[PDB]
């Protein structure tokens with residue numbers, strides 16, 4: 001039987017790595033992309049379809065689920081996996097980002113955050129870890145504070161310091177719950193905004209506590225790719241090399257490629273799902289907007305090489321019609337293709353690292369995607 | 372290879388019949404229920420899922436498709452079957468009902484109908500048959516006038532007489548188009564409102580022209596079940612016994628059972644799809660509204676006996692959550708279950724007629740469904 005958690009690196013190229021995380025509910029191939037399933041569903045897909053595209057793990061959210069249908073309710077119904085019909089690993093964010101993003105009123109303190117639902121609710125490190133336990137998450141995220149961008153050095157520091165205190169509280173809450181400690185994994189989240197010294201302090205604090213994996217927090221919050229990449233350049237090497245590195249909320253295909261070049265192993269974002277429903281399809285020649293009139297009579301599949309079931313069977317012209325009509329099948333087909341594209345991107349990344357030709361792959365990918 | 376059209380009756384019980392229609396694109400088991408696919412999609416289902424529920428044939432609409440994406444456009448793209456990915460028979464309504472139902476302004480004449488889209492457009496018997504040819508419909512409906520309910524005898528008569536003139540025009544248009552005449556079938560539509568003498572005149576006119584099948588038009592337009600059944604009692608026996616009888620727009624499960632008792636072989640309605648998206652699930656114990664709070668923690672499947680993939684895998688509690696959240700997967704799961712339920716109803720009807728126990732089935736079905 002598989003262990004609670006084991007990360008193994010099979011191949012490297014520069015700072016890039018490829019390997020596997022073994023957990024009780026399954027193996028995760030890295031670098032990994034996690035489709036987002038915020039309301040206990042990956043929007044417009046059955047879990048079997050999510051799996052058929054190649055996903056090994058999906059992301060859920062402490063924030064949305066604690067509000068609807070409720071964490072205790074999900075536990076009473078047998079946990080998130082049983083509830084939504086996904087039997088493989090699930091990573092859950094801790095709520096700290098979403099509360100500050102989506103809540104109408106918030107009160108922040110050293111204890112945690114109180115907020116008004118988009119009734120009043122509270123989140124603290126202890127309550128966050130508890131909710132993630134009630135959901136039955138396999139990868140639990142520490143409860144942190146995502147520092148807004150831009151931040152002054154003093155505010156970035158104060159924020160990061162609070163997040164490190166909360167990281168220790170998260171660790172202790174997780175370890176106190178024997179069933180959770182034995183069956184799930186806990187990741188810490190590095191903060192520090194764009195400042196190298198604060199990123200270093202945060203990495204040191206997280207490593208002293210000790211986690212199963214380390215996320216780079218506080219990015220993909222408006223800073224732009226050049227700045228994100230600059231911060232990754234110095235931040236990722238600060239993290240323990242032998243554990244996974246997770247870049248929260250990233251991202252566009254080129255962001256993923258560059259982040260892997262910088263040592264990131266795990267990704268999530270709503271882009272393929274959300275923009276799929278809005279008419280944007282990913283292709284190896286760059287994104288297209290299927291709503292455009294130029295596709296009304298185009299018999300080609302969304303992408304000429306894609307192996308997904310959508311590209312096997314339906315034309316751009318048909319999907320154009322569905323999305324213009326507001327048909328649910330349009331959302332379904334666009335989302336399945338985009339998630340499949342993301343998984344094919346991760347497979348090409350993994351295979352190119354394993355073969356020592358990832359640098360070449362990145363160059364070829366960009367030349368074509370941005371032609 | 373299969374013929375253009377052959378209807379064979381395998382078993383009878385009273386006025387009820389069970390059998391098959393063989394067409395080039397497939398066999399249709401009767402009595403048959405046709406899921407409705409008005410915008411070139413059965414809402415929220417891939418065609419493989421429509422087939423997996425047991426459907427042999429689906430319904431499309433001259434009216435919606437001629438407006439979006441356009442009949443000529445669909446023909447240029449290879450026809451409706453290729454466009455939407457359904458390779459089995461498709462029946463198309465002729466537009467005469469939908470124009471009067473959905474258009475904002477209409478001008479009616481002996482030539483046809485001109486209307487404003489929900490730009491100006493025209494429909495006539497000739498143009499309707501042509502559009503159904505461009506779509507590549509397998510069962511083409513004559514272009515008729517659906518008499519509003521209630522109608523006075525004089526207006527019902529005038530309307531029915533016009534429909535019979537249009538039925539002959541429909542026949543001639545269809546026969547003039549060699550490819551259509553050789554590969555598709557043409558059904559006539561009986562009119563006459565609730566009046567026995569007008570129903571008889573219309574049946575006689577349609578039989579004199581000669582059609583592959585006969586629809587009972589002008590019902591399911593507000594008259595209620597008692598009156599519908601009373602009109603079917605005398606109207607269906609007027610139609611040729613050796614051809615299929617199609618009751619347009621029916622209906623609720625009990626309406627289907629009673630209509631089969633009265634000699635109907637074919638059905639369509641938006642109820643399972645549309646009401647599925649709205650939260651109504653069909654069960655052998657009657658419909659339920661999955662939005663109701665009583666289902667928030669109910670671990671049972673939608674229906675306790677249903678063999679569909681939704682009932683194999685997900686709880687009422689989960690689907691309740693999805694529909695309350697407005698999630699697309701909720702529409703998907705509710706629609707698949709309801710279409711599957713309708714197909715299971717038709718299978719039970721067919722098997723009970725084949726075994727000479729349809730009367731008993733109808734009685735048992737009602738006792739439980741209305742308990």
Ligand SMILES: CNc1nc2cc3c(=O)[nH]c(N)nc3cc2[nH]1
Nearest residue numbers: 096097146217218219220248249
């Ligand atoms: C879409 N962009 C994005 N940046 C993020 C940062 C964090 C972060 O710093 N902390 C936690 N807990 N979640 C996050 C989620 C993010 N999502």
Ligand SMILES: CNc1nc2cc3c(=O)[nH]c(N)nc3cc2[nH]1
Nearest residue numbers: 467468517588589590591619620
């Ligand atoms: C939902 N109820 C319903 N009654 C109908 C009658 C006709 C009818 O008399 N003619 C044609 N062409 N379509 C029809 C579609 C119907 N749909």
Ligand SMILES: [Zn+2]
Nearest residue numbers: 306308311337
């Ligand atoms: Zn594809």
Ligand SMILES: [Zn+2]
Nearest residue numbers: 677679682708
């Ligand atoms: Zn079912």
